[PDB]
């Protein structure tokens, strides 16, 4: 009976509620304040020109249909109420195949403040496309983008925004970094408008500034390349009459140099 007070509140909110219509439809633009907490910056796959990233994708918006008055000022709810109400159809423009984790249950939270404000975070594993220009490989750096926005609603329907200062809205977990051969120098964010066949859309861009660590390639390609060059120069110190010995020096190093060249390209596209 103690919970029956709160049950009657949720029934009232969803009574005559149409989750097919965005807040302020035909009256106002829907402002969605969004921020990202990167629990771990996944590995970068330069072979596929992509990177993985695990985030708590938070987004908040005002829905006047969900105002209430009761003993609590915030209704801390589970994923079930998320499907009952309207939520933005955000998507990642350069996303390749992302995962919305649902183990043990859908990793989502939904909090309804008494003024109608909504906080709707969800745990995601976004696998995004990062076009790399490998002209300076392995001594190269990239700014891998993470663009997102509404799939269906144009700029006149829903507009996105950073919940805090744009510098302070993408936060990376201090211990969260699954990069092996890269360093996350930092991130920068921006917002803009993109034209398309369907109309103008707001795009929220985040650029993660990476820098390859060449420690692997030094001891995998350069050192073998440097030593086989030294090997070929040992022949100069052998007497000119040792034709088989100096010949095997030349052919062996040349063949070794060939396989290293073929072997080196195998990592990257």
């Amino acid at each position, epitope marked *: 009976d103690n919970t029956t007070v709160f049950t009657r509140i949720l029934d009232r909110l969803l009574d005559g509620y149409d989750n097919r219509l965005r807040p302020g439809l035909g009256e106002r633009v829907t402002e969605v304040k969004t921020d990202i907490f990167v629990t771990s910056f996944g590995p970068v796959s330069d072979h596929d020109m992509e990177y993985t990233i695990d985030v708590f994708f938070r987004q908040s918006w*005002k829905d006047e249909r969900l105002k209430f008055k009761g003993p609590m000022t915030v209704l801390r709810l589970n994923n079930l109420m998320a499907s009952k109400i309207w939520t933005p159809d955000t998507f990642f423009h350069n996303g390749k195949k992302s995962v919305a984790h649902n183990m043990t249950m859908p990793n989502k939270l939904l909090r309804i403040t008494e*003024d109608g404000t909504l906080l709707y975070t969800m745990r995601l594993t976004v696998r995004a496309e990062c076009p790399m220009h490998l002209e300076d490989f392995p001594m190269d750096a990239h700014a891998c983008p993470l663009k997102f926005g509404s799939y269906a609603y144009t700029r006149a329907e829903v507009v996105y*925004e*950073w919940t805090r*200062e*744009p*510098a*302070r809205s993408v936060v990376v977990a201090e211990d969260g970094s699954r990069l092996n051969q890269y360093d996350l120098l930092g991130q*920068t*964010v*921006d*917002s*803009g408008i993109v034209q398309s066949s369907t109309g103008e859309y707001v795009v929220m861009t985040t650029h993660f500034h990476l820098k390859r660590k060449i420690g692997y390639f030094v001891i995998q390609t350069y050192l073998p390349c440097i030593m086989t060059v030294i090997l070929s120069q040992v022949s100069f110190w052998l007497n000119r009459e040792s034709v088989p010995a100096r010949t095997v020096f030349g052919v062996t190093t040349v063949l070794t140099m060939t396989t290293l060249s073929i072997s080196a390209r195998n990592s990257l596209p």
Partner: antibody, heavy 117, light 105 residues
């Protein structure tokens, strides 16, 4: 139309405190953060701090950390800045502005002149 | 914090001539640069936001633009009502404005 009306001209001696108000009108007062700006005579605008009116969360410029305290009243759509330990350098005109987006300050205050001497 | 520097401390361009005002940010600010006009004994007036978008109700003569760290406000034909101090600010981080740039004839 929106209008941010402020306290008005003030005169005060060094050492004592002062409070300045910023009255909102025309928009939902709790939707947008309220920012406070200082402008000394012929000098660049300086940001003091902002307060989220809904939950009264405040963030202060490090220079003004402690010098100014931001308070808000939900009932009367007003924002208050309280200054303590006033000195000569604190003589300036103080503005209040609302951050409509993370892009611009939409409506600014009339400007509250302050004089310390 | 991010410091905004406006290279022309003052401008003496004659009326009706194109005049350009510059605004430099020490570090990246994206496109969150806004321009405000402050006539004497007046509060700032928003003119350009987004470093390129023009606030509603502003004359079309004003046209801002610029990539990160390099932002300019160009007035194609300054008129008798555009004489005032101009402020450029950034909101990519905690807001910091630049030194005002004054116009004269």
């Amino acid at each position: 139309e929106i209008q941010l009306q402020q306290s008005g001209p003030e005169l005060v001696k060094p050492g004592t405190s002062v409070k300045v108000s910023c009255k909102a009108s025309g928009y939902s007062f709790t939707d947008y953060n309220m920012y406070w700006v200082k402008q000394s005579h012929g000098k660049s605008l300086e940001w003091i701090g902002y307060i989220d009116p809904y939950n009264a969360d405040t963030t202060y410029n490090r220079e003004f950390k402690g010098k100014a305290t931001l308070t808000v009243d939900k009932s009367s759509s007003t924002a208050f800045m309280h200054l303590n330990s006033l000195t000569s350098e604190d003589s300036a005109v103080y503005y209040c502005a609302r951050k409509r987006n993370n892009f611009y300050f939409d409506y600014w205050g009339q400007g509250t002149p302050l004089t310390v001497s | 914090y991010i410091v905004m520097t406006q290279s022309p401390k003052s401008m003496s361009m004659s009326l009706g001539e194109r005049v350009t005002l510059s605004c430099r940010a020490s570090e990246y600010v994206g496109s969150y640069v806004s321009w405000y006009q402050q006539k004497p004994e007046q509060s700032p007036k928003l003119l350009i936001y987004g470093a390129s978008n023009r606030y509603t109700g502003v004359p079309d003569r004003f046209a801002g633009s610029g990539s990160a760290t390099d932002f300019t406000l160009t007035i194609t034909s300054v008129q008798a009502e555009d004489l005032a101090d101009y402020h450029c600010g950034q909101t990519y981080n905690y807001p910091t404005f630049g030194g005002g740039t004054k116009l004269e004839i």
